[PDB]
Design a protein around this motif. Structure first.
Motif, mmCIF file in Angstrom:
data_model
loop_
_atom_site.group_PDB
_atom_site.id
_atom_site.type_symbol
_atom_site.label_atom_id
_atom_site.label_comp_id
_atom_site.label_asym_id
_atom_site.label_seq_id
_atom_site.Cartn_x
_atom_site.Cartn_y
_atom_site.Cartn_z
ATOM 1 N N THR A 162 4.584 -0.991 -2.249
ATOM 2 C CA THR A 162 4.164 -0.330 -1.031
ATOM 3 C C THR A 162 4.975 0.967 -0.953
ATOM 4 N N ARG A 163 4.211 1.980 -1.371
ATOM 5 C CA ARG A 163 4.816 3.295 -1.307
ATOM 6 C C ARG A 163 4.873 3.859 0.104
ATOM 7 N N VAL A 164 6.081 3.726 0.645
ATOM 8 C CA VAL A 164 6.446 4.115 1.993
ATOM 9 C C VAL A 164 6.913 5.516 2.354
ATOM 10 N N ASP A 224 12.700 -6.565 6.791
ATOM 11 C CA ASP A 224 12.223 -7.912 6.572
ATOM 12 C C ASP A 224 10.897 -8.024 5.838
ATOM 13 N N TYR A 225 9.908 -7.295 6.368
ATOM 14 C CA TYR A 225 8.592 -7.352 5.753
ATOM 15 C C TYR A 225 8.098 -6.398 4.675
ATOM 16 N N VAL A 226 8.519 -5.140 4.803
ATOM 17 C CA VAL A 226 8.128 -4.119 3.857
ATOM 18 C C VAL A 226 9.075 -3.959 2.674
ATOM 19 N N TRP A 227 10.354 -3.847 3.026
ATOM 20 C CA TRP A 227 11.339 -3.840 1.967
ATOM 21 C C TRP A 227 11.101 -4.686 0.713
ATOM 22 N N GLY A 241 0.709 -1.259 0.000
ATOM 23 C CA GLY A 241 0.000 0.000 0.000
ATOM 24 C C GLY A 241 0.745 1.323 0.000
ATOM 25 N N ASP A 242 0.043 2.252 0.669
ATOM 26 C CA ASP A 242 0.552 3.513 1.158
ATOM 27 C C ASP A 242 0.691 3.649 2.666
ATOM 28 N N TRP A 243 1.867 3.412 3.264
ATOM 29 C CA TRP A 243 2.298 3.490 4.641
ATOM 30 C C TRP A 243 3.024 4.776 4.995
ATOM 31 N N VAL A 244 2.408 5.455 5.959
ATOM 32 C CA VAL A 244 3.041 6.597 6.570
ATOM 33 C C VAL A 244 3.595 6.142 7.912
ATOM 34 N N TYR A 245 4.898 6.392 8.038
ATOM 35 C CA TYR A 245 5.625 6.123 9.253
ATOM 36 C C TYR A 245 6.453 7.315 9.723
ATOM 37 N N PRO A 246 6.193 7.678 10.983
ATOM 38 C CA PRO A 246 7.073 8.573 11.716
ATOM 39 C C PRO A 246 8.434 7.913 11.898
ATOM 40 N N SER A 247 9.441 8.659 11.449
ATOM 41 C CA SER A 247 10.832 8.308 11.689
ATOM 42 C C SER A 247 11.128 7.409 12.882
ATOM 43 N N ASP A 248 10.955 7.970 14.083
ATOM 44 C CA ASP A 248 11.045 7.279 15.352
ATOM 45 C C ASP A 248 10.370 5.912 15.427
ATOM 46 N N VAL A 249 9.197 5.786 14.804
ATOM 47 C CA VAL A 249 8.490 4.517 14.730
ATOM 48 C C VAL A 249 9.395 3.513 14.038
ATOM 49 N N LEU A 250 9.821 3.927 12.836
ATOM 50 C CA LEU A 250 10.836 3.162 12.144
ATOM 51 C C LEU A 250 12.008 2.759 13.042
ATOM 52 N N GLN A 251 12.631 3.826 13.545
ATOM 53 C CA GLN A 251 13.772 3.692 14.427
ATOM 54 C C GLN A 251 13.790 2.656 15.539
#
Lengths: 1027, 412, 216
Positions: free
Chosen positions: A885-887, A874-877, A856-866
């Motif tokens: 999946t436009r990240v 593993d999963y999104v890449w 999909g379209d996933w919005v992630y706050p930096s820190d969340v990623l971090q």
């Protein structure tokens, strides 16, 4: 002596940014030529950067052709290379990994960088020389002839260059206003002298110019003219000393020495605060002043003189009583001891903090009654001494001394068991302890205790008064805290000194007190009650002594009343520590000082002044036990010279003293002090919430929840920065840091009087050129960030498998990058995953519980990623790399490391980005990988171009030019130079000083360069040694 | 020296419910700053007409001049109030007015005195008068305020030429400053005058006053290379675009005709262009310093004055010193100056006069359009960081030529 | 300015000695009067002020008096704003006596220790005036009974004409009457409640006391 480094000089070029080529081109192509190549071909060196890719980069003083190195320069590498290290310097202590920096630490680190950008640019743009360029290339133009390196000229003056090609760069140059090259006007009118300034159109950085401009305006403000200087000195001299007023025109005189009281005041307090807790720290200073005083005074302490006088009395040998020998022996025959006495005088000027107290040495040792004549003498020493001490409490002790002796002949009205009959005088050093008796003499039984009454009545009546006197100069004022400008107080009365010769003038306050005391003791001796008990012969002798002592020829009192006032004036102006006085009372209980105070901080709005300050804040009064005996010696045996002419004497004596220019250098220190205070505040108020209106620009620049600890860290580094910059060993600000929390500098200059009387004095800080510049830099930064390799926006990571030049650096950001986006779903939740249940794909928990495929379209706050990196990788890449999946990576602002690649071939970003992805840590990020194909100047084929990273904002601003020395840019097409960069040179319309801030940094405009000598203060004026 | 009734006049509002600024603008001011003393303001002003005077908040130097005044005007009403007020933004950092404080916590009781258009008498407030020493630097600032605020024009600047007893000491010193623009001299002067609680020592005072004349005399035409005050005139450097910077210049040509005794004028500028003319402004700041020392003839009589600034205390009258103000439009004066110059035969009009009149025409246009365009915003939003003023105000009138002629006769 | 201190500066406004003057008291505490520990300042004040009060009573329209305003004006030391001090209270007195006010029993010729100590004790009580003053000026009654000349420093009136009664009249010089006095209680229409009456009696009574019987 650590003098300030105010005068820092630039010649060469006023520019902290560099115009840079990043890739020139080696034979390109075979079936053509590299149009770029033409440089060397005509043997000339181009003034402008002519190749394929060219950028601009932040390089502090890069074009500084000065012999002067300040060595705090901000050097940045081309965006092509990883500048990571610049932005991790301050707080990335915990995050040792060289690739990665801590995002939260970013606003701080940038803020320092900017601070230092400012500081390694505090520079007097100085004129070199000028040449009348009458040639073909120049329109009779007045060029800066830098004594060496011809290179620089080209770069400084583009316009000089001739046109061999019909190229992109040529085109630009040939559409701009040429005449504005070099010097339009030179400024001097004085005939047979060189110029005051030059007015030259130069390659010059507006922002840097601005900085330097300000600095100059600050310097100018402090600069003083001969006449005023004359004034200052004449005033300080009190006409005793004399200088040669020249009638000459004023030759551009650079002496920035003058500083407002204000600053001297804050230096003073700073000084005071650094005196950690022990009383003894004051002593060396006050000692030193006493020696200085001793060496300067026309005075003679020849005790010996005394001894002769007393040797005149002849008496019967039968008597065991030797008053004479007792005295001598008690007095410590030495003639070196004078320290105690000098100290007294000196201490009168520093009552606000340095004190002389009457000590438990020359204190009635026996006490007893009135048995021992020694113990009588003991009192006479005290009562003489006492009034000399900076002790408010001295009259009390002076009484109580005697009252002690009087234990048993008559009962007296004592206090509590505290304030018993036999409690020593010494203890009575507090307003609350001022004895009823003492306070009401008139109550004390006239019939019962006549003598003691007499003595108190003597105390009340004949006690010395405080008087006042001038010092300093009018123009400036004084660095008087608690006391009026130019005025000092004397505890003794001030009787003016005329320009005369010698006199033994008995008509003094002090003389009177000697006499009365002696007559008092005489009465004691002759009192009925005692007379009956004594050998009469003895009584005679006693009295004889006493009287002979009173008859003595003693100058000291005349000197106290007459000369000591000015003595202290003269000192006061060139003392290490300016006079710090707090109102010297007399004997007035309801107004007696308990302490003097310093306030470094305020917890939000505490106004609990006396209730808190007394017990919670730093109480400044040091105490110094001074020695009775020596005082009284000196007082009794005071002589001057035979052929004394004060006028004369003082002329000579004071003369070298005011030859020490060091005084003025103090001033300069104090202003930087002030400046540092202010600067500290405003910076710390961009990471920390302060009580203080500041501008706040970098609020989008994501920073951690700054603590007190952290703010303290930042403060120190800022503080060390200043110290470095002005080349200063001594303590600046530091003081305040020691006190656990520096973040709140709310400063108060306070004192306490026992009867709840606080004068807490707050000093607002006057204007600040340096702060203002900083903030200016700050605002300009908000737009010009990519010049510092800093970029704007969020990343979206999408599979783009294309044929064409979509610059990562300039995204025309219309995809659904936003919250209101179609299938543009947010995920900031922690840890949470759905593995494989019921045949289903492994799914993520959206914001709002719903489990959704890893497409999909996933919005992630930096820190969340971090916090949860590995999972993503593993999963999104997968889906990045080979699906869709436009990240969306919410980053705010960030740094970027550029790559340049061969447009004619098939590239994929994936290894690059894979690296990025895996690298990400809960505690740091690596620079952003922005790989780009080169602009090409020829019809060539197509290749597959797979990119991923696209940004919310255009960041392309830092790119200075493409191809330049080329005829057409075709494949991979781009833009050329920015004319906005040189408005005036480009376009004839612009009179090169128009409000460009904060839009664009101009690079070529009128530079002002100046010719200013630094003459000594001692040099400006001629001396008259004949004083 | 302590001119007891040191009464100062706060600015009116342009048919506004509120004093001239919005909350954000005042925030900017108070907060991003700290001290109530002109250091900060002067910092900006000083930068020898290089930096563009434009900003988001602050359109011109003069802009800032105006919001400086209004700031003052508003925030004084607090502490200068009858029983002490202070809240909403400003609760004064100490009674002694030390610093612009955002409301101390447990301190509500001193209200925000909602005043209209009102003069105040500094010495009638017990706190103010106690602190007579510290009062002195701010009074200077005060005057600056008052003497713009009095009117709706460009600043009311005062002039003085005491003729005959001229100190030799003044001469000597002043010569050393030759080469510098009026601006920097002014700056030092103000700084001194503030730094020391103000002296009766006429030295300083005289000097400023002479300077003011020489500038004005220069600017008019009366004074130039060949007709000097003993050597003194101000040289208008760079004869192309309108930036023709007045530097103090000493050249011996003639010593111009000593006037009869004591010559006094006051100038105002009718045209909004004053705003971008640091020269004009810097004289006005000079004449303020003068004021602190001296009890100037009771202010420009109400004949040329808006109704709100009539009948003021002991300021406007009718039968005093300088009943009418001398009034100019800056671009016509430059023409005036060239006139004189040509009348004297200093120079051919041919190329000199034509050229510069061409450039100042340009400069007018630029200025006029910018000032209008900027005024548009405040003339639609609740915020005012600028002088209020109609397009008809730009008019080439306002007693421009009379001023010039008076200035000249003054020199006789 | 010269005088960087705040002992009291008593500047004359009327007729100054041999020119325009002040008196500046020394920092000294006079204990002559129990239990006041005061400087000379206060003593100047009250003296002159009493002299005025006395003169006021004696005031003739066509008999040339040496000085109308027999009074001095303070400058330094006005650090207080409220009436908490003798020095402060003394200023009100001073202001109203110049304004034209009269005491009841006027002061003897050279005032006795006894009477001064009485008068002071009385003064150092409670209750506040109407016509205050700014410290920058002397303010001498707007109702033009006061003979206000043109003085150096005093402007005129209080700046603020408020509202309060006044009138002109001289004092009847009546000797100390060595006899107890009878009172005809002529009544006014404001009629207190019995309990309060009683109460207030209780509050002010000198009674109980031992009654001389006399004769039946």
């Amino acid at each position: 002596a650590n003098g300030p480094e105010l005068i820092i000089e630039d010649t060469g070029l006023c520019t902290s940014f560099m115009l840079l080529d990043n890739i020139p081109s080696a034979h390109l192509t075979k079936e053509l030529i590299g149009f770029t190549w033409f440089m060397q071909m005509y043997q000339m060196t181009p003034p402008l950067p002519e190749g394929a890719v060219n950028r601009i980069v932040c390089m502090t003083n890069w074009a500084s052709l000065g012999d002067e190195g300040r060595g705090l320069e901000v050097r940045l590498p081309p965006p092509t290379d990883s500048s990571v290290h610049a932005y991790k310097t301050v707080l990335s202590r915990g995050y040792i990994d060289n690739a990665q920096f801590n995002p939260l630490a970013l606003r701080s680190n940038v803020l320092l960088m900017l601070l230092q950008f400012t500081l390694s640019n505090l520079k007097i743009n100085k004129s070199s020389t000028f040449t009348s360029d009458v040639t073909t290339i120049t329109s009779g133009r007045m060029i800066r002839a830098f004594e060496g390196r011809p290179e620089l000229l080209a770069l400084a003056y583009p316009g000089r260059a001739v046109l061999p090609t019909q190229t992109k760069n040529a085109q630009f140059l040939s559409t701009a206003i040429a005449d504005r090259i070099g010097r339009l006007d030179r400024a001097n009118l004085i005939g047979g002298e060189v110029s005051a300034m030059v007015e030259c159109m130069e390659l010059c950085d507006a922002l840097t110019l601005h900085i330097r401009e300000t600095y100059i305006m600050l310097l100018r403000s402090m600069h003083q003219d001969p006449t005023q200087i004359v004034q200052i000195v004449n005033e300080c001299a009190n006409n005793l000393l004399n200088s040669t007023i020249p009638i000459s025109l004023r030759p551009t005189i650079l002496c920035p020495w003058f500083a407002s009281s204000e600053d001297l005041r804050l230096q003073e307090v700073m000084h005071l605060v650094n005196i950690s807790s022990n009383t003894a720290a004051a002593l060396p200073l006050v000692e030193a002043l006493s020696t200085l005083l001793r060496s300067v005074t026309p005075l003679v302490l020849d005790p010996t003189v005394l001894t002769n006088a007393i040797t005149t009395i002849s008496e019967s040998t039968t008597q065991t009583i030797s008053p004479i020998s007792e005295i001598l022996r008690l007095l410590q025959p030495m003639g070196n001891d004078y320290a105690a006495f000098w100290k007294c005088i000196a201490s009168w000027a520093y009552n606000g903090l340095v004190t002389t107290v009457l000590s438990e040495d020359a204190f009635p040792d026996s006490s007893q009654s009135i048995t021992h004549l020694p113990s009588m003498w003991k009192c006479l020493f005290l009562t003489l001494a006492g009034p000399m001490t900076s002790d408010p409490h001295s009259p009390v002790k002076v009484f109580m001394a005697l009252a002690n002796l009087l234990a048993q002949p008559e009962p007296i009205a004592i206090g509590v068991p505290g304030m018993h009959q036999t409690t020593p005088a010494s203890q009575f050093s507090h307003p609350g302890v001022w004895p009823p008796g003492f306070l009401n003499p008139q109550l004390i039984n006239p019939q019962q205790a006549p003598l003691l009454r007499a003595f108190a009545e003597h105390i009340r009546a004949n006690w010395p008064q405080p008087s006042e006197f001038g010092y300093g100069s009018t123009l400036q004022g004084s660095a008087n805290l608690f006391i009026p400008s130019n005025r000092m107080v004397y505890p003794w009365p001030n009787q003016p000194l005329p320009r005369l010769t010698v006199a033994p003038t008995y008509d003094s306050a002090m003389s009177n007190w000697i006499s009365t005391t002696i007559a008092f003791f005489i009465r004691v001796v002759n009192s009925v009650n005692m007379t009956a008990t004594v050998n009469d012969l003895t009584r005679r002798t006693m009295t004889g002594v006493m009287t002979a002592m009173r008859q003595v020829k003693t100058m000291t009192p005349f000197y106290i009343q007459h000369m000591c006032p000015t003595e202290l004036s003269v000192l006061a102006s060139v003392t290490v520590t300016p006079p710090f006085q707090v109102p010297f009372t007399r004997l007035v209980q309801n107004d007696v000082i308990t302490n003097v105070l310093v306030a470094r901080v305020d917890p939000a709005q505490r106004g609990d002044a006396a209730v808190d300050i007394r017990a919670t804040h730093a109480t400044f009064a040091a105490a110094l036990p001074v020695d009775p005996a020596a005082i009284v010696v000196a007082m009794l045996c005071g002589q001057t010279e035979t052929n004394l002419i004060p006028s004369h004497h003082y002329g000579k004596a004071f003369a070298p003293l005011f030859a020490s220019n060091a005084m003025f250098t103090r001033n300069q220190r104090a202003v930087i002090t002030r400046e540092a205070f202010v600067c500290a505040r405003s910076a710390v108020a961009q990471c920390q919430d302060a009580g203080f209106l500041v501008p706040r620009p970098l609020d989008a620049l994501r920073q951690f929840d700054v603590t007190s600890a952290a703010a303290a860290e930042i403060m120190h580094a800022v503080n060390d920065a200043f110290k470095t910059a002005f080349d200063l060993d001594g303590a600046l600000l530091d003081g305040l840091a020691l006190y656990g929390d520096p973040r709140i500098a709310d400063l108060s200059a306070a004192y306490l009087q026992y009867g709840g009387n606080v004068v807490r004095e707050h000093v607002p800080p006057g204007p600040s050129h340096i702060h203002r510049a900083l903030q200016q830099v700050e605002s300009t930064f908000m737009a010009e960030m990519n010049l510092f390799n800093v970029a704007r926006g969020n990343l979206y990571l999408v599979q783009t498998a294309t044929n064409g030049n979509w610059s990562p650096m300039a995204p025309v950001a219309a995809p659904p990058f936003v919250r209101g986006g179609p299938n543009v779903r947010v995920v900031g939740r922690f840890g949470t995953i759905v593995p494989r249940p019921n045949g289903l794909e492994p799914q993520l928990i959206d914001d709002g519980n719903v489990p959704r495929d890893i497409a999909g379209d996933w919005v992630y706050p930096s820190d969340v990623l971090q916090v949860s990196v590995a999972v993503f990788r593993d999963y999104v890449w997968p889906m990045v790399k080979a699906g869709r999946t436009r990240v969306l990576v919410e980053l705010g602002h960030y740094v970027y490391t550029l790559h340049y690649y061969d447009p004619q071939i098939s590239l994929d970003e994936a290894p690059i980005l894979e690296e990025w992805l895996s690298k990400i840590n809960p505690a740091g990020i690596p620079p952003v990988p922005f790989c780009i194909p080169i602009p090409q100047v020829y019809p060539c084929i197509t290749a597959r171009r797979v990119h991923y990273a696209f940004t919310s904002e255009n960041n392309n601003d830092s790119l200075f030019s493409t191809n330049a020395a080329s005829i057409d840019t075709a494949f991979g097409e781009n833009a050329a130079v920015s004319p906005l960069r040189w408005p005036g040179l480009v376009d004839p319309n612009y009179r090169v000083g128009t409000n460009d801030l904060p839009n664009r940094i101009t690079l070529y405009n009128s530079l002002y360069r100046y010719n200013f000598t630094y003459p000594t203060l001692d040099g400006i004026m001629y001396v008259r040694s004949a004083t | 020296m302590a001119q007891r009734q040191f009464f100062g006049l706060t600015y009116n509002f342009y048919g506004q419910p509120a004093p001239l600024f919005d909350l954000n603008d005042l925030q900017e001011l108070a907060g991003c700053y700290a001290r109530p003393w002109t250091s900060r303001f002067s910092h900006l002003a000083i930068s020898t007409g290089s930096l563009p005077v434009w900003s988001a908040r602050y359109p011109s130097v003069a802009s800032r001049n105006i919001v400086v005044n209004t700031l003052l005007g508003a925030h004084l009403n607090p502490f200068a109030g009858g029983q002490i007020t202070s809240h909403q933004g400003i609760t004064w950092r100490d009674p002694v007015l030390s610093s612009l404080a955002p409301v101390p916590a447990i301190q509500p009781p001193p209200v925000w005195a909602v005043a209209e258009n009102v003069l105040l008498d500094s010495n009638n407030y017990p706190t103010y008068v106690l602190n007579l020493s510290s009062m002195w630097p701010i009074n200077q600032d005060v005057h600056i305020m008052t003497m713009w605020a009095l009117s709706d024009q460009g600043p009311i600047y005062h002039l003085e030429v005491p003729v005959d007893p001229m100190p030799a000491a003044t001469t000597a010193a002043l010569m050393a400053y030759t080469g510098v623009p009026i601006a920097h001299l002014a700056q030092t002067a103000y700084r001194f005058a503030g730094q020391l609680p103000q002296s009766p020592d006429s030295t300083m005072v005289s000097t400023i006053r002479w300077l003011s004349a020489i500038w004005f005399g220069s600017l008019t035409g009366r004074l130039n290379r060949s007709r000097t005050c003993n050597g003194f005139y101000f040289e208008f450097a760079k004869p192309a675009l309108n930036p023709d910077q007045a530097v103090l210049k000493w050249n011996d040509g003639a010593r111009a005709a000593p006037p009869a005794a004591a010559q006094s004028s006051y100038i105002r500028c009718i045209s909004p262009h004053w705003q971008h003319q640091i020269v004009e402004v810097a004289g006005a700041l000079m004449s303020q310093s003068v004021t602190a020392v001296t009890g100037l003839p009771a202010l420009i009589d109400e004949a040329t004055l808006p109704a709100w600034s009539q009948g003021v205390a002991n300021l406007t009258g009718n039968g005093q010193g300088v009943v009418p103000c001398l009034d100019y439009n800056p671009v016509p004066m430059a023409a005036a100056r060239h006139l004189q110059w040509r009348q004297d035969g200093l120079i051919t009009a041919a190329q000199e006069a034509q050229l510069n009149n061409d450039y100042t025409a340009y400069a007018l246009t630029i200025e006029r359009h910018l000032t209008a365009m900027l005024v548009a915003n405040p003339i639609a939003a609740g915020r005012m960081p600028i002088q209020p003023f109609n397009a008809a105000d730009f008019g080439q009138a306002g007693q421009t030529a009379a001023a010039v002629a008076l200035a000249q006769a003054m020199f006789v | 300015a010269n005088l960087a201190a705040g002992p009291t500066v008593l500047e004359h406004f009327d007729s100054p000695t041999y020119g325009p003057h002040l008196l500046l008291p020394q920092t000294g505490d006079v204990l002559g009067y129990s239990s006041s520990l005061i400087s000379q300042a206060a003593l100047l004040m009250v003296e002159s002020v009493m002299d005025a009060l006395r003169d006021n009573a004696n005031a003739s329209a066509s008999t040339a008096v040496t000085r109308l305003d027999q009074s001095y004006h303070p400058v330094t030391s006005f650090d207080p704003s409220t009436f908490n001090t003798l020095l402060q209270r003394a200023t009100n007195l001073a202001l109203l006596a110049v304004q034209g006010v009269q005491s009841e029993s006027a002061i003897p010729a050279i005032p006795t220790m006894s009477d001064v100590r009485s008068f002071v004790a009385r003064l150092m009580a409670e209750g506040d005036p109407q016509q205050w003053f700014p410290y920058r000026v002397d303010q001498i009654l707007y109702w033009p009974e006061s003979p206000f000349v043109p003085p150096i420093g005093p402007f005129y009136a209080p700046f603020r004409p408020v509202n309060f009664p006044f009138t002109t009249g001289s004092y009847t010089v009546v000797p100390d009457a060595s006899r107890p006095l009878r009172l005809l209680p002529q009544y006014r229409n404001a009629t207190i409640t019995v309990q309060q009456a009683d109460d207030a009696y209780e509050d002010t009574a000198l009674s109980p006391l031992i009654t001389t019987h006399g004769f039946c």
